[PDB]
């Protein structure tokens, strides 16, 4: 019962700025979104917003922007006397509710979504005499604030002359129209987008500048219905009209559909009823968060998808990443499998095909970031779309979890060839030495290389910067060591491809940290990163590889090969199945032979050295760059031998390494490049934490895994409060950082609730 979980997240708020930001530039309120809609609503918090759901949040293609503080706010008059209401307002999974109570009149307002563009408000009015109803609204004027403090005197219309917002009256309500604004990082409109309000009863609407007042007279107790729709193109506007009319013709049908969908999510989702009430509430928060970050098809993305955060500065609209999706879809398989499937389809829908206009050399590649607007390179004006890199291979994992739940053979038939193409791309564009063990790297790209195919890098010395090109030049510069630091777009891209931006093992270390490392006996050269171009035999530039093979991606490709074999077997392709199982074993042998270090009892990336070692390994484990969460990836993925796993778990459980106040962070305390406030060099993310506990369980250490989960539950700050879910934690203090309403945290917190959290 959804009524059991009121106000899991604080959804109150009265925004006064289009960009009403917190310190980290995220919208500081948490609107309710559902069904993939492109608008959301907040709850009223006092007399000034009472009677309406303030802060109409609009998703303007790739960003969240507020429209109004009050919009369609109801006030009530009985024979010239204004009714004085007291307010009760709560959220539940799937709805916002507010109740206005006065002596002789009551109003109950329930707000749910009805289509992928339309929310539905029931306004149930109890009164034994006639009443005059008044709705009012005003469009926002002020542009931007941080923590309530305006940054400037700027107005929305001043910053955006072409926005040109106008309210018009219609036969059954009103609309706001918006002009075309192509503000790459802020505000993206087509010029055809509208916000429409349709009502079940006749109203008389007056318009004064950018505000309105609508009036209606009722005879007594009645229930009316209002639809709100944010429609982003002319085609959307046309198509929604018949749906709006059906909704206002059968509102009970839409309310019930939403009620029933959410009862299902909860019945399916909450499969550990012996968790404490506080633990169950965390699960429900996760479920609301994931479903709120779900977006229906829009622009270039022709499928429903789930973004990393609807309120996030850079994660909103329908901006979609691959490994976020794999994590999201794995979790969502267990309560919203329809949208899990869609999320996966969205990512693969822009997989590179033979004859691609931009990167024909990258067949099978899956873009890092897709969104409403294509990049200029593909004829759009989007600044987010990214094809510099992909993300790690967790796709088959996600796909097979969906099949295991749904048992839909059509689904495996659908995804198998895309997954195979993705696999083949890695071994063709990310395996320089041809040993079947992939490297992270970077695509041929305007950010990475000159037009002539030469790899870019910047040498820094004091205040001097010099930007150069060419791998032979790089090799020379690196050997001489005549610089303070290097910045290499390909390096950034490669770390992005791992998903662990600026991680230690990819050669990222602050200058003070690097000096300590040398003053204690280390060679500066240990932290220098080396590259190679990957070419076909006819000389075509395919991309770049780090001269380093990563133990996380090896481990993920190992599990991915097994999942592919299962899929091949399901589809009656026994020879393809056999090949994937054989490919998986070869990688297991390599991971255990090459990437395990028996001395420090841990797994690491290895270098691709000038010649391979005697045992066929490309090089030695990069033990000197320290231990990371990639080191338990062989356990999570099942590539590890029992003995190596036994070794790894001792390290994980060591307070000197990973067993911290919030355990299992992204770099061990012993890592030379550790920092408690560095996202992927110390901070604890819930995905890597969960991969760790699952890896432990798989090799017989569930008992210890349960203890870490309990430690996490007691020490991770904010967990049992009503704030939005964030991305990561200080391993020493447990303090939260990162975008609010963060999808994969929700996904892995949900999984932790199912698998590990207990009373
Ligand atoms: O613009 C490409 C770039 O975008 C993000 O900043 C990525 O960094 C984080 O965000 C995504 C989405 O949550 C995660 O998949 C990454 O693991 C995060 O580090 C960055 O890697 C690129 O994708
Ligand atoms: Ca290789
Ligand atoms: Mg680009
Ligand atoms: Mg980053
Ligand atoms: Mg199976
Ligand atoms: Mg085996």
Curated annotation (Swiss-Prot):
Segments of this protein annotated with the region Linker: 231-276
GO annotation, biological process: DNA damage response; oligosaccharide catabolic process; trehalose catabolic process
EC number, UniProt record: 3.2.1.-
Family (UniProt): Belongs to the glycosyl hydrolase 63 family.
Organism whose genome encodes this protein: Escherichia coli (strain K12)
Region of interest: A domain: 277-759
The entry's keywords: Calcium, Glycosidase, Hydrolase, Metal-binding, Signal
GO molecular function: alpha,alpha-trehalase activity; glucosidase activity; metal ion binding
Functional summary from the UniProt entry: Glucoside hydrolase that cleaves the alpha-1,3-glucosidic linkage in nigerose. Has very low activity towards maltooligosaccharides, soluble starch, nigerotriose, kojibiose and trehalose.
Domain of life the protein comes from: Bacteria
Name of the gene this protein is made from: ygjK
Pfam families membership: MGH1-like_GH (PF22422), YgjK_N (PF21152)
Protein known as: Glucosidase YgjK
Catalytic site: 501 (proton donor), 727 (proton acceptor)
UniProt xrefs under Gene3D superfamilies: 1.10.287.100, 1.50.10.10, putative glycoside hydrolase family protein from bacillus halodurans (2.70.98.50), Ribosomal protein L30p/L7e (3.30.1390.40)
Assigned GO CC terms: glucosidase complex
InterPro entries (UniProt xref): 6-hairpin_glycosidase_sf, 6hp_glycosidase-like_sf, Glyco_hydro_37, MGH1-like_GH, YgjK_N
Binding residue positions for Ca(2+): 431, 433, 435, 437, 439, 549
């Amino acid at each position: 019962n959804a009524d059991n979980y009121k106000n899991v997240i604080n959804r109150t708020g009265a925004p006064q700025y289009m960009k009403d930001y917190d310190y980290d530039d995220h919208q500081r309120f948490n609107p309710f979104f559902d069904l993939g809609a492109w608008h959301g609503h907040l709850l009223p918090d006092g007399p000034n917003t009472m009677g309406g759901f303030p802060g109409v949040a609009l998703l303007t293609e790739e960003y969240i922007n507020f429209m109004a503080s009050n919009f369609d706010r109801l006030t009530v008059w009985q024979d010239g006397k204004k009714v004085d209401f007291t307010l009760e307002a709560y959220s539940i999974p799937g709805a916002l509710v507010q109740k206005l109570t006065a002596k002789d009149v009551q109003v109950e307002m329930t707000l749910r979504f009805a289509t992928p563009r339309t929310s539905l408000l029931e306004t149930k009015i109890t009164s034994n005499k006639p009443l005059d109803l008044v709705w009012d609204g005003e469009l926002l004027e002020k542009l931007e604030a941080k923590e309530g403090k305006p940054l400037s005197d700027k107005t929305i219309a001043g910053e955006y002359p072409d926005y040109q917002r106008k309210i018009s009256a219609t036969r059954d309500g009103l609309k706001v129209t918006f002009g075309k604004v192509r503000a790459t990082w802020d505000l993206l409109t087509s010029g055809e987008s509208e916000y429409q309000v349709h009502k079940s009863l006749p109203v008389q609407t007056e318009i004064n500048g950018n505000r309105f007042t609508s009036k209606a007279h009722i005879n007594g107790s009645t229930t009316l219905y209002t639809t709100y729709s944010h429609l982003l193109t002319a085609q959307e506007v046309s198509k929604e009209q018949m749906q709006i009319r059906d909704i206002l013709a059968r509102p009970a049908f839409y309310l019930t559909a939403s009620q029933q969908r959410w009862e299902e999510y909860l019945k399916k989702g909450l499969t550990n009823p012996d968790a404490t009430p506080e633990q169950t509430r965390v699960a429900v928060k996760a479920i609301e968060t994931l479903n709120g970050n779900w977006r229906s098809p829009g622009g270039a993305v022709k499928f429903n998808t789930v973004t990393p955060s609807v309120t996030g500065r850079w994660f909103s609209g329908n901006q979609t990443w691959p490994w976020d999706t794999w994590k999201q879809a794995f979790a969502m398989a267990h309560f919203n499998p329809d949208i899990a499937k869609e999320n996966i389809r969205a990512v693969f829908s822009w997989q590179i095909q033979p004859g691609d206009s931009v990167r024909p050399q990258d067949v099978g590649f899956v873009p890092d970031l897709i969104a409403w607007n294509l990049s200029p390179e593909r004829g759009g004006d989007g600044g987010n779309w990214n094809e510099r890199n992909t993300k790690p291979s967790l796709a088959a994992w996600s796909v097979m979890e969906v099949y295991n739940v749904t048992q839909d053979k059509t689904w495996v038939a659908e995804m198998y060839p895309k997954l195979v193409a993705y696999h083949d791309w890695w071994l063709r564009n990310r395996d320089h030495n041809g040993n079947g063990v992939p490297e992270y790297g970077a695509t041929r790209d305007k950010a990475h290389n000159t037009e002539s195919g030469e790899m870019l890098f910047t040498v820094k010395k004091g205040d001097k910067e010099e930007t150069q090109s060419g791998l032979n030049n790089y090799a020379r510069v690196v050997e001489k060591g005549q610089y303070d630091s290097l910045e290499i777009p390909a390096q950034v891209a490669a770390s992005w491809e791992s998903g662990r931006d600026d991680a230690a093992v990819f050669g990222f270390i602050d200058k003070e940290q690097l000096d300590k490392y040398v003053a204690n006996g280390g060679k500066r050269s240990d932290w220098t990163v080396k590259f190679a171009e990957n070419r076909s035999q006819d000389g075509t530039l395919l991309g770049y590889s780090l001269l380093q093979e990563s133990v996380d991606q090896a481990s993920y490709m190992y599990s991915d090969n097994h999942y592919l074999a299962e899929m091949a077997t399901i589809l009656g392709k026994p020879e393809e199945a056999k090949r994937y199982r054989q490919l998986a074993q070869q990688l297991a042998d390599y991971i255990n032979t090459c990437m395990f270090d028996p001395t420090t009892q841990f797994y690491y990336d290895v270098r691709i050295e000038d010649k391979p070692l005697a045992n066929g390994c490309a090089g030695k484990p990069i033990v000197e760059r320290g231990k990371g969460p990639e080191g338990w990836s062989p356990l999570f993925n099942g590539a590890a031998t029992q003995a190596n796993a036994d070794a790894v778990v001792k390290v994980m459980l060591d307070p000197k390494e990973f067993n911290t106040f919030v355990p299992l962070g992204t770099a061990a305390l012993t890592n030379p490049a550790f920092g408690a406030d560095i996202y992927w060099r110390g901070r604890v993310w819930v995905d890597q934490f969960w991969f760790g506990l699952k890896g432990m369980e798989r090799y017989g250490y569930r008992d210890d895994a349960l203890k870490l989960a309990d430690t996490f539950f007691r020490h991770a700050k904010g967990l049992t409060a009503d704030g939005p879910i964030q991305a990561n934690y200080n391993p020493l203090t447990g303090a939260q950082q990162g975008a609010p309403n963060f999808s994969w945290s929700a996904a892995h917190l949900y999984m932790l609730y199912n698998d590990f959290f207990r009373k």
